[PDB]
RNA sequence: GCGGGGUGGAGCAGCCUGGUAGCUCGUCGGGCUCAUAACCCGAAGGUCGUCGGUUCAAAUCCGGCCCCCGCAACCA
RNA sequence: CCGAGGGUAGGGCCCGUGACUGGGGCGAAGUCGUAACAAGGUAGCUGUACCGGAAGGUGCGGCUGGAU
RNA sequence: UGGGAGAGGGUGGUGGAAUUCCCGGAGUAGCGGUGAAAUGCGCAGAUACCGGGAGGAACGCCGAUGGCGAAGGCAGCCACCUGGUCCACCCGUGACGCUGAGGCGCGAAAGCGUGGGGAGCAAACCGGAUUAGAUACCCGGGUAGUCCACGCCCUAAACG
RNA sequence: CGAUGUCGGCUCGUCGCAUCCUGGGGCUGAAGAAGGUCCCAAGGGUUGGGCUGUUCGCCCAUUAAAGCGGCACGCGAGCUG
RNA sequence: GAAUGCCGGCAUGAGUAACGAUAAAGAGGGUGAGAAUCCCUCUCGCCGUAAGCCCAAGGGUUCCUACGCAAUGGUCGUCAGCGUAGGGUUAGGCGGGACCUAAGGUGAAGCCGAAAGGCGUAGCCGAAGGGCAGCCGGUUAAUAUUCCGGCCCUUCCCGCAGGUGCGAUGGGGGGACGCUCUAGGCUAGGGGGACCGGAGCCAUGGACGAGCCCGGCCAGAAGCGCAGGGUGGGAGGUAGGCAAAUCCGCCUCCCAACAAGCUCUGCGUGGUGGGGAAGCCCGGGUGACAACCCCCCGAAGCCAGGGAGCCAAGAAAAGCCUCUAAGCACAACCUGCGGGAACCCGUACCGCAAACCGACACAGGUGGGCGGGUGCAAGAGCACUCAGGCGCGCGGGAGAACCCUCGCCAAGGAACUCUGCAAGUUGGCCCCGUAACUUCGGGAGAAGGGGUGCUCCCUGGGGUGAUGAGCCCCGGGGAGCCGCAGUGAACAGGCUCUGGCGACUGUUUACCAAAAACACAGCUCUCUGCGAACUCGUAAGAGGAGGUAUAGGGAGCGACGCUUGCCCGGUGCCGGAAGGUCAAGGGGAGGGGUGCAAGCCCCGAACCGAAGCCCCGGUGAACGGCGGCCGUAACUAUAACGGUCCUAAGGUAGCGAAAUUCCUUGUCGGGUAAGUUCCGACCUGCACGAAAAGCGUAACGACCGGAGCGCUGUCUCGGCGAGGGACCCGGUGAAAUUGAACUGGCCGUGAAGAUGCGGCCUACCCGUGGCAGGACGAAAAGACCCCGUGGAGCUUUACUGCAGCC
RNA sequence: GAGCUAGCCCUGGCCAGGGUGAAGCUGGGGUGAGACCCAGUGGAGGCCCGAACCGGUGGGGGAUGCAAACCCCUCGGAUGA
């Protein structure tokens, strides 16, 4: 349940803040943080290569656990549920009975206190990791690897999920969040359950400053420039696009497809995204 | 108002200094050329 | 100034590529109808804006006058 | 001191009145179509939504105050 | 106190038939539709037939003139929470009742907000026909919506 | 064109007369009072305001009257802009 | 002899403008050839959240003294930041190195690139961040946390005493953190005292007084005291922290749990060492054996790494403690004491400026700390003032025009003007009060109105203390007083009604535009399944992002309310194993050149052969588009209805002479005496119209309209007054410009606007203060226009390449 | 050539004083429990007033300037993009 403010300033009318309820730990695990090089959107050459980025809020990188097959068998208790500024979802601190401490993305339904494991023998229960060839059919899962032992690369954002639609050889059929039906190896670890923090999309940034707090500098339209800068530039008064609308770099932006045709991946995609 | 020249000894040495020149291939020529013209001072006088 | 245009009562093909003027609506005559519409069978009505030229022959090609649509009329 | 009342400023109610605009009522024989009353030629009425020159139409649900 | 019926309600489950689609076989010159047609689809392999897959909505027979609820209303099956009825014994209290301006609550459908979902159907809409016309009636498409949760709306031939 | 600053306003004016007024006459379809019309006359005078950037124009209230023009459509090394 | 030629020299303008803030001056006494300008005194003025003081950067001897005065100093110069000389900067503790890391930089390894070079993990460098040991006073012409004095502390080496499994670039802990609000206790710093010291003073009518004027503290180890931070203890197990591990982590039982103890800091005390005014006498001497006390106010600073709440979720490594390994356990480390050793660099002076950046001793710009008192609601505002520093490096006169800045005005009150431009009004605080509309927050300081000083009388609570006095802080009631006036000076809203545009706070054309433009939360389209798309790069490699479709990119619109209609023929994009065209290649029917031939050589039809274009279907919050003629109603007029040609389809809702309406000041109503503007309506909309979005909308605006109240020098219509210039005297002394000049009016003429030609008229020679009509005045080789087969930016279905992609 | 300017990165610093009074919390009214109302507290915010500081609205001055963008009066933001 998102939390609204009363309109005691012009921008408070629509601003909404997360209710933060399921958070239990109000400071990170010092053991498990490293600094975070804020790029501002510039590469090694120093050139900007992503626009309208920077001057946000400082933040430390909460290390996260995208393998979990690191320790096959060793259980772990749900210590706390914490606020990460580095991703949409929430992070959960786990205390392994190994004594080891790790952070994972908190699925929905996880409560502080439960024990979670990872492996071929794991119970089909939220928080647990298992290779995909061992998860039941049609069980919604998240934090899905893409290739065996290469790291959890899929469904890692707030309120995402992925049902397991079928089985075919050493590969399982995956409805990715987008809708793309895809083959993924059965030997890819995944965590049963939908990601928590579902109420994220309903957050209303509320005012321009709060955008900047996120490292989000103002976006300026091509229609507001000159021809030097952008195809949409120029004109006397306002002016329509006057050509198929383009990126600043020329390529057309409406409906123009750009997945590389000869990508070897295609040989495992079944049904390109929906809607 | 605020003018263009706002002196800074660290900046002046770290930009036009001898060392800042002897690394880039261009910088060396600048020294070479200033040694050909008999420039008394191949680089600015930074007090350090 | 540049472009298109005027043809039975209404609105339009035929002009480029000369000889043949045509489609719908309406007008008239007769049918079904108690009667009107509709609907059916018929028939009428156009010297093609105007004057001159080309031609064996001009709505059709050219020129002039008339009149109607459209575009332009900017720089200080 | 109070005080008829005079004046300054801001309020509430009511009556008249207004370019123009909304429909309503009536008006011996005006124009369009033909929705309703026969299963009125798609049974009707209805709350509601959208739409159409107009009566109306359609959709979702509901009533018989509908016929064989 | 013991007893019975029942689609009364709320949540979590789940089964099968069918429609639509997707992939594969097999196969060919039509399919579809109507008052009769055309639009539409189909030799770029449709329809009809077999297998696998995706998903949603609605529950055939039972089912009836039936049962239930105060009304609006409620129907596959399973489980948990729960309301009002009715029967029997004459056990308990001892007029404690009837009603009800106000108030409060519930309130089909449509509609609205925020999200999901979307097979079938279908306001608006487009096309084909009919027609003098046809902004309709019929046919081919088809968007909201119809559906899950949450918050409004509070109307009715809400009727016996 | 190795630069003659463009409208309108303000300020200061000055000249022309094809006279708005005032002075003097003829004619009048001049009874009187009041006009129409031409003749002479440039000495002086010719208002305040609403609208619009405006010139101009219309309009309100007066007036003897609310003239019209030229001077780089007078006047920015005087202002305004 | 001319090139707005080049270099230099010298004129003109001209003894002209100006002499750099309107904070301000006067006299006396010195010095010296010379004095408004130097030194001293006395008076007078200005700065005092500064114009005072202490740091940093930068400047680089400007510091001090002595002797100078050509030049620099806007005048003068005996003076100086100027010339000459000699002097002057003292550290184990302050700053920076022999410490650590940050962005970044560099870079064994490794990767890449025609060469040059480009990347890169570890590592190394890299601070105004971490870390680390000096405080008070005196002294010097000039240095001082540096020298001296007093009291303290740091680390390295060596020996000695006690203790301990010692030992690390290896594991662990810690270092270690945000924003706002804020407790308790202190200190800095202040105010007062009838108390303590103080050289003194009694004026001019009064005063020998609890009178006046001055001062009343600074540092400090141990110990304690106060206030805080930090911190649980034991055992057993133990697969984790890449070896080891007694450390840490994890689980369990034990007690202990506001606490208390250990530990660290701040404050107080404290051996002890310092200071010490006015006033008087020639920086010093006294005062003085100075006293050194109490109450109050009180931090934004200190205990600190405190607390609480919030969301945007807030550096690293080291010193440091801990655990172990190799080793070694003669050792080694720890705690305590003693001695010994402790290096390199900076240190002067300016430092909101006359020493820095601005060509200048330039009204400009420059980060950090302290910044006292009184009153004013508070404060860093305002006025005054201490300390401290100044009077801005030309002055003396005069009392014209005019200009700047300022003051006041009779009757009128926006009649001014494009516009109330400007200037008035209003002003703080307290209480009374306060509309449409609304998104219920607001509009709102709405509007408007009353109050305000001082005397006395009674009384309400609060901090401190003690519950009392005293100091202090908010108040209340009544009775009086003076003036024209009590926020008596200074600082401090004018308001209302009504339109457009943009939701709003924001951003912007540095140096003519701050707006209606940009942005903006928010809506939609779309791309992208991760070695993502996309961006920079030849690449390597990065960003994206240590993110993963609730995400990331691109584009359009732009809070929010109600909505966003029809057209897919063209154009894009998207889907389409058929069909057609198709390039290299395959193929080699059939020809050719040659040679005695075997051969060698060339040409070469069909037929197979990508994407791409054609062909088919989709797509509007994709580029884009939304008709014409004619007729028809019991009057006129207008057409609900019809006829017809054309399209891919013909503008729906809403709105409309509008930021759009040409004809146009359209017509009608409102307001006004009068209204091309304004508001409200009509609709033949030249030429609105639905995400280059349509119609609204509370609040908001230094945005643009319109009306009104108040008050006005805006005006009728101008008057007087002030000061700084202008004016005269002394000093100093530019500038554009300039063919040469002995440079008049007219009417004419001339390349068509004559001081210069003709004729006439007029005119003695030279200045000065004033005005701007002319010298087609100055300035700038017209920025408009054309010209040039001159250039550059920008577009595209112009041509031809290239990158990229297929 | 980024010692000016513009954006980003790293690390520090600054923002007097005064007004308004969100959620929450406590108590109380209320109910079947509620929603919710009241007072008290608390002290939110690209909130309000206004110095510093960051600006540059309107005017006047200035125009061989004190200045190759400055001066006076006035005006905007000032816990925040
Ligand atoms: K032009
Ligand atoms: Mg939640
Ligand atoms: Mg609210
Ligand atoms: Mg949350
Ligand atoms: Mg760390
Ligand atoms: Mg990053
Ligand atoms: Mg790099
Ligand atoms: Mg980018
Ligand atoms: Mg960027
Ligand atoms: Mg998170
Ligand atoms: Mg994220
Ligand atoms: Mg796989
Ligand atoms: Mg959430
Ligand atoms: Mg969002
Ligand atoms: Mg952020
Ligand atoms: Mg945006
Ligand atoms: Mg933008
Ligand atoms: Mg532009
Ligand atoms: Mg372009
Ligand atoms: Mg364009
Ligand atoms: Mg434009
Ligand atoms: Mg533009
Ligand atoms: Mg335009
Ligand atoms: Mg394009
Ligand atoms: Mg591309
Ligand atoms: Mg600047
Ligand atoms: Mg500055
Ligand atoms: Mg310079
Ligand atoms: Mg430096
Ligand atoms: Mg620097
Ligand atoms: Mg260098
Ligand atoms: Mg370099
Ligand atoms: Mg080289
Ligand atoms: Mg030399
Ligand atoms: Mg050099
Ligand atoms: Mg033809
Ligand atoms: Mg023919
Ligand atoms: Mg015919
Ligand atoms: Mg003929
Ligand atoms: Mg032009
Ligand atoms: Mg009276
Ligand atoms: Mg009918
Ligand atoms: Mg019918
Ligand atoms: Mg019917
Ligand atoms: Mg019907
Ligand atoms: Mg319909
Ligand atoms: Mg029929
Ligand atoms: Mg076919
Ligand atoms: Mg075939
Ligand atoms: Mg589907
Ligand atoms: Mg009984
Ligand atoms: Mg009894
Ligand atoms: Mg419904
Ligand atoms: Mg209802
Ligand atoms: Mg019924
Ligand atoms: Mg010219
Ligand atoms: Mg001109
Ligand atoms: Mg008469
Ligand atoms: Mg004119
Ligand atoms: Mg006119
Ligand atoms: Mg008269
Ligand atoms: Mg002229
Ligand atoms: Mg002139
Ligand atoms: Mg003219
Ligand atoms: Mg003219
Ligand atoms: Mg002139
Ligand atoms: Mg001028
Ligand atoms: Mg002028
Ligand atoms: Mg010559
Ligand atoms: Mg010259
Ligand atoms: Mg030359
Ligand atoms: Mg020269
Ligand atoms: Mg010489
Ligand atoms: Mg000379
Ligand atoms: Mg001279
Ligand atoms: Mg002279
Ligand atoms: Mg002169
Ligand atoms: Mg001057
Ligand atoms: Mg000067
Ligand atoms: Mg001044
Ligand atoms: Mg001054
Ligand atoms: Mg002054
Ligand atoms: Mg002053
Ligand atoms: Mg002497
Ligand atoms: Mg002298
Ligand atoms: Mg003197
Ligand atoms: Mg004197
Ligand atoms: Mg002087
Ligand atoms: Mg002196
Ligand atoms: Mg002060
Ligand atoms: Mg520095
Ligand atoms: Mg000298
Ligand atoms: Mg001399
Ligand atoms: Mg000499
Ligand atoms: Mg000099
Ligand atoms: Mg000077
Ligand atoms: Mg002198
Ligand atoms: Mg001299
Ligand atoms: Mg001398
Ligand atoms: Mg010295
Ligand atoms: Mg050493
Ligand atoms: Mg280092
Ligand atoms: Mg380096
Ligand atoms: Mg340092
Ligand atoms: Mg130190
Ligand atoms: Mg000390
Ligand atoms: Mg030990
Ligand atoms: Mg160690
Ligand atoms: Mg941290
Ligand atoms: Mg810090
Ligand atoms: Mg102290
Ligand atoms: Mg005080
Ligand atoms: Mg006496
Ligand atoms: Mg002490
Ligand atoms: Mg262990
Ligand atoms: Mg002395
Ligand atoms: Mg501070
Ligand atoms: Mg804290
Ligand atoms: Mg916050
Ligand atoms: Mg690091
Ligand atoms: Mg031994
Ligand atoms: Mg050394
Ligand atoms: Mg020193
Ligand atoms: Mg200053
Ligand atoms: Mg300062
Ligand atoms: Mg100085
Ligand atoms: Mg300068
Ligand atoms: Mg010079
Ligand atoms: Mg000076
Ligand atoms: Mg003081
Ligand atoms: Mg006070
Ligand atoms: Mg005050
Ligand atoms: Mg002075
Ligand atoms: Mg005089
Ligand atoms: Mg007056
Ligand atoms: Mg008045
Ligand atoms: Mg006016
Ligand atoms: Mg006037
Ligand atoms: Mg006005
Ligand atoms: Mg004004
Ligand atoms: Mg009102
Ligand atoms: Mg009110
Ligand atoms: Mg009203
Ligand atoms: Mg206020
Ligand atoms: Mg008031
Ligand atoms: Mg008030
Ligand atoms: Mg009173
Ligand atoms: Mg008094
Ligand atoms: Mg004031
Ligand atoms: Mg104010
Ligand atoms: Mg705005
Ligand atoms: Mg809005
Ligand atoms: Mg802009
Ligand atoms: Mg500008
Ligand atoms: Mg510019
Ligand atoms: Mg400029
Ligand atoms: Mg500039
Ligand atoms: Mg502008
Ligand atoms: Mg502004
Ligand atoms: Mg914008
Ligand atoms: Mg906006
Ligand atoms: Mg929106
Ligand atoms: Mg990364
Ligand atoms: Mg996103
Ligand atoms: Mg984006
Ligand atoms: Mg907006
Ligand atoms: Mg826009
Ligand atoms: Mg199309
Ligand atoms: Mg198309
Ligand atoms: Mg198409
Ligand atoms: Mg549209
Ligand atoms: Mg177009
Ligand atoms: Mg088109
Ligand atoms: Mg008629
Ligand atoms: Mg409609
Ligand atoms: Mg209109
Ligand atoms: Mg008009
Ligand atoms: Mg009008
Ligand atoms: Mg309009
Ligand atoms: Mg228009
Ligand atoms: Mg007009
Ligand atoms: Mg008019
Ligand atoms: Mg009209
Ligand atoms: Mg438009
Ligand atoms: Mg558009
Ligand atoms: Mg538009
Ligand atoms: Mg559009
Ligand atoms: Mg509203
Ligand atoms: Mg509004
Ligand atoms: Mg508005
Ligand atoms: Mg504005
Ligand atoms: Mg206007
Ligand atoms: Mg008025
Ligand atoms: Mg005056
Ligand atoms: Mg007078
Ligand atoms: Mg004067
Ligand atoms: Mg004289
Ligand atoms: Mg001189
Ligand atoms: Mg001569
Ligand atoms: Mg002539
Ligand atoms: Mg002449
Ligand atoms: Mg002459
Ligand atoms: Mg001559
Ligand atoms: Mg002569
Ligand atoms: Mg001659
Ligand atoms: Mg004469
Ligand atoms: Mg003069
Ligand atoms: Mg002149
Ligand atoms: Mg002139
Ligand atoms: Mg010139
Ligand atoms: Mg110029
Ligand atoms: Mg030239
Ligand atoms: Mg030229
Ligand atoms: Mg040419
Ligand atoms: Mg030529
Ligand atoms: Mg050319
Ligand atoms: Mg250019
Ligand atoms: Mg190339
Ligand atoms: Mg910079
Ligand atoms: Mg600098
Ligand atoms: Mg910071
Ligand atoms: Mg501040
Ligand atoms: Mg404050
Ligand atoms: Mg309150
Ligand atoms: Mg709370
Ligand atoms: Mg604020
Ligand atoms: Mg200005
Ligand atoms: Mg002003
Ligand atoms: Mg001037
Ligand atoms: Mg200038
Ligand atoms: Mg200023
Ligand atoms: Mg602001
Ligand atoms: Mg900030």
Numbering used by the authors:
A (entry chain 1D): 2 to 276
B (entry chain 17): 1 to 48
Copy the relevant paper text.
Curiously, when we modeled adenine in the position +6 of the A-site codon, the exocyclic N6 atom of such adenine residue appeared to be within H bond distance (3.0 Å) from the oxygen of the C7 moiety of SAR. To verify whether SAR could directly interact with the mRNA on the ribosome, we determined an additional 3.0-Å resolution X-ray crystal structure of the 70S ribosome in complex with the P-site tRNAiMet, SAR, and an mRNA-containing adenine residue in the third position of the A-site codon. We observed electron density for the entire A-site codon, which was even stronger and more clear than for mRNA with the UUC codon. Most importantly, the adenine residue in position +6 of the A-site codon forms H bond with the C7 extension of SAR, which is likely to stabilize mRNA, especially in the absence of the aa-tRNA in the A site. Altogether our structural data suggest that depending on the sequence of the A-site codon, SAR interacts not only with the 16S rRNA but also with the mRNA and interferes with the accommodation of the A-site tRNA by sterically hindering its access to the decoding center. SAR, with its unique C7 moiety extending into the mRNA channel where it could interact only with particular codons, is likely to exhibit mRNA sequence-dependent mode of action.
Tetracyclines inhibit protein synthesis by binding at the A site of the small ribosomal subunit and blocking the accommodation of an incoming aminoacyl-transfer RNA (aa-tRNA) into the A site of the bacterial 70S ribosome. More specifically, tetracyclines bind at the decoding center (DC) between the head and the shoulder of the 30S subunit, in a pocket formed by helices 31 (h31) and 34 (h34) of the 16S ribosomal RNA (rRNA). In this work, we determined two (2.8-Å and 3.0-Å) X-ray crystal structures of sarecycline bound to the initiation complex of the bacterial 70S ribosome and found that this antibiotic inhibits bacterial ribosome in part using a mechanism of direct mRNA contact, which has not been reported for any other tetracyclines so far. SAR is chemically distinguishable from other tetracycline antibiotics by the 7-[[methoxy(methyl)amino]methyl] group attached at the C7 position of the ring D.
